Every structure is written in C-alpha cells, then in structure tokens.
C-alpha cells in the first residue's frame, strides 16, 4: 500500500496482510531510517494500534497509510 509523509516522499511497499501494525512499522524501519517506536500510521482517520492486524482495518492493497512522527511533549 501507499504511505505518505506529511508534505513528503511517499513510497509503497507491499507485504501480505497477516501483518501486525508492528510489522508494517518494522518493514518501515527496514526501508526508511525511522524506528517503529517513533512512527505513527494513520489510516482513514484512525490511528493504527500495534495489536490489530492490517486485515482488521479493511485496508486493501494500494491503500494509503500516513506516517506521522511521534511528538515529544514535556
């Protein structure tokens, strides 16, 4: 599927949806520099939580995920 950085480079990498959001973020650490820890993916207005499964979100191939960087508030 497609994932876009806010006003930024958008790549698509496809992996069969058995995958846990932890794993999309995990293959994301293997394709772009960022650590799964800091990456929060947003799809169709919902933050994807690590526990649930791409299949769970009705996400079809060629669908658009959004990568937002975790903010640090103190």
């Amino acid at each position: 599927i497609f994932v876009k950085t806010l006003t930024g480079k958008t790549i698509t990498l496809e992996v069969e949806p058995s995958d846990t959001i932890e794993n999309v973020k995990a293959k994301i650490q293997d394709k772009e520099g960022i650590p799964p820890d800091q990456q929060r993916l947003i799809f169709a207005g919902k933050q994807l939580e690590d526990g649930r499964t791409l299949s769970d979100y009705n996400i079809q191939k060629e669908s658009t995920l959004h990568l937002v960087l975790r903010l640090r508030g103190g």
Partner: protein, 317 residues
C-alpha cells in the same frame, strides 16, 4: 522465617513462605510491598503476614486473572504499571473552579492534555476492567491508578517527554460509547458506483486528519482503483461530541468568530525537538489555558492546535 500474601488483583491471594538467605526476587520474583519494589531486598519479619503485588513468575491461575483484569498485555506490563504507579505518586493535581488539571513535573504536560480532554468525553467507558475501575477512581478524585495505567498502556516512560495526541487515541481504542453515535460516509464513481461506509459508537466521534468541522464534511476528490476520480463526503452524523485531531498546525483561536468547540490542545515548541502541551477550554467567551496547573486566559491566541473537541452532532445532507 515469615509468611506473605501474594496477589495480582487484590482479590485472589496465596501464602508464600520465605527465608532470609536470598533476595525476594531470588525466591519469588519481582514484588511490590506498599508501592515499593522490594524485589532485591531480603525478607524480614516486618513484611510477615502482609500482602505483596507480584509482577513476573506468574502462576497459571494468576495469569488467567491478569488477562481478565487487564486484557492481553506484554510480560513487562505489570512491572511497568506498578513502578509507574510509585514514580507518579508524587505528582499533584491543582483544582480551579472544580476543573482538575495535572501540575507540571517530569515532562508530563502531554498527560495534562490527555486527561483534561478525557474528562470532557460524555458517556464513555473502558472495556478493560482494570482501566475502567482506575478511571472511575480518577473521577472520584484519585488519579494515580488511571495515570500510571495509561502510561503503561501507552508504553510511556516516567520522566520522558511523549506525544499527547498519540496517547489520547490509544487510550480511546480501549474505550466504548454508552450512547448512540453514527456517522456515514458516501463514496462514488461513475463506473464502480456508490458506497455507504458506516461507523457507529466511539468510532463515530473521532477523526485524525482534520481539525475543523467544515473540512470533515467537505467533498474529497481522489483516484479510484479502476483509474478515475473517486469522490467522498459525509452524509449523516449524530454524536454526543466530536473529537478531531491533526498535526500541530498554526492558527488563531478567536471567540469573536463564536467557535463551535468546547476545548482544544496546543503544541508549543518545535516539532523536531521537545515542546510543551497546553489544554484550553471555552467557557466564558474566553479561552482558559490550563498549562499544567498554571491557569491563564486569552481572547485570541496564535498557537498550533493539535486536538479539537466539538459538541454533539446532528447533521444530515
């Protein structure tokens, strides 16, 4: 040699007899006694007959209770939850005109924003017993359990700055709505056709990507799978409140415009660095800013709004 009561839920207890030749951890495991991690201490008569909270080396039965009480958590959850509870015991809430807000300490402003927002959500409850109970306690005036719990669930670390908006939505993923909310999206294409996409309950009161009511309703054009424009628009919406969240974006909050929202969160600082969260509400045609216990008021404010909270929706198109 002493006897101690071991539990993970405060309802089921077992006797564990201990000697004083190794540490508590050596003989039993990671244990808390009155909030204190005493795992690496040697058992003494003071703790005789007393109850202890165990975090690992769980029984088969205790594990069953852990899952029931807290849901499926990683093995470190209990240690993290209990320790966070002790770490955060010293945090203070200040109350202004009955509004409770968490006093700034150890980079916790993001939490002040999460809690103050949650305090505003009508008719919500948590699926996880432990979380629900902690929540009820939170509303009772005792917020330690709820705070520590939410950090454990959010995999926050005490003292480290963290994203407010992100935590708010993980927390809500554990909640449910006690009333009826409904939102319906209509998508259409001349070849594929029309599609109604329905959301009910909490799912109908939250959206990440938009921070204004108009933008949620406004018609959105893109390309369909078949190789043409797919359109999308909101065609019904009936909610008790509406939580819209997006990236820190700069705007002017004005009460002259006679806003729709009851409250909003603001991110102060730069984004590639460590900032500060502030919770703000409109009551009084004025924006009351709750800066982690510190209260101030403005007519308008140049700020980067993240989360926005709207009242109940009754919309049809």
């Amino acid at each position: 040699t002493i006897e101690v009561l071991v539990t993970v839920d405060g309802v089921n207890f077992r006797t564990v007899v201990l000697n004083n030749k190794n540490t508590y951890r050596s003989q039993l495991g990671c244990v808390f006694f009155n909030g204190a991690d005493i795992s690496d201490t040697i058992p003494d008569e003071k703790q005789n007959g007393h109850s202890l909270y165990l975090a690992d080396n769980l029984t088969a039965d205790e594990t069953k209770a852990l899952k029931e009480l807290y849901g499926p958590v990683d093995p470190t959850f209990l240690h993290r939850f209990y320790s966070l509870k002790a770490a955060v015991h010293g945090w203070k809430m200040v109350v202004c005109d009955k509004v409770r807000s968490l006093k700034l300490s150890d980079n916790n402003s993001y939490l002040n924003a999460v809690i103050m927002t949650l305090d505003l959500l009508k008719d919500i409850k948590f699926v996880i017993p432990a979380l629900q109970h902690a929540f009820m306690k939170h509303k009772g005036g005792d917020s330690t359990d709820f705070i520590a719990l939410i950090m454990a669930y959010g995999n926050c670390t005490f003292g480290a700055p963290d994203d407010a908006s992100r935590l708010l939505h993980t927390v809500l993923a554990k909640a449910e709505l006690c009333c009826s909310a409904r939102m319906v999206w209509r998508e259409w294409c001349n070849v594929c056709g029309i599609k109604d996409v329905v959301l009910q309950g909490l799912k109908a009161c939250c959206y990440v990507g938009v921070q204004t009511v108009e933008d949620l309703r406004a018609r959105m054009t893109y390309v369909c799978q078949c190789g043409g424009e797919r359109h999308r628009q909101l065609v019904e919406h009936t909610t008790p409140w509406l939580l819209l969240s997006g990236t820190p974006n700069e705007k002017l909050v004005t009460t002259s415009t006679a806003p729709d929202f009851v409250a909003f969160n603001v991110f102060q600082g730069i984004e590639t660095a460590v900032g500060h969260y502030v919770h703000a509400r409109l009551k009084g045609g004025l924006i009351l800013k709750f800066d982690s216990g510190t209260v101030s008021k403005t007519s308008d404010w140049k700020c980067k709004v993240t989360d926005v909270l709207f009242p109940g929706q009754k919309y049809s198109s």
